[PDB]
Write a protein that binds this ligand. Structure first.
Ligand SMILES: [Au+]
Length: 124
């Protein structure tokens, strides 16, 4: 069983690229990170920062989670992110995505000991 922390790193971390490598990025990364396996994951965000910098958000600004839980944290600094958004043309198993790059504050849900990111909640 994949740990919640490892699943967060697979679904949301991409420290290799500074920003949305290309117009191809989401099509390749949604597939390579196994987010198009059983269905086309409809939206997903990748963060282009060090793992240590993303883990550190669990000690930053405490905010409400979209689901009403209290364990979400907002980054004090903006981070380089890529939003991936499934198109209309997109029909499983040929999942098609729009790659958008932005610099935004991330919001992540944290749990455990050690206290680490487990859920990408939002960017603002
Ligand atoms: Au800011």
């Amino acid at each position: 069983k994949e740990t919640a922390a490892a699943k967060f790193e697979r679904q949301h971390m991409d420290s290799s690229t500074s920003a949305a490598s290309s117009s191809n990025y989401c099509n390749q990364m949604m597939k390579s990170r196994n987010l198009t396996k059983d269905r086309c994951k409809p939206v997903n965000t990748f963060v282009h920062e060090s793992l240590a910098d993303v883990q550190a958000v669990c000690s930053q600004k405490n905010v409400a989670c979209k689901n009403g839980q209290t364990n979400c944290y907002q980054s004090y600094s903006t981070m380089s992110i890529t939003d991936c958004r499934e198109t209309g043309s997109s029909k499983y198993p040929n999942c098609a995505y729009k790659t958008t790059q932005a610099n935004k504050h991330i919001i992540v849900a944290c749990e455990g000991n050690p206290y680490v990111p487990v859920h990408f909640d939002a960017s603002v």
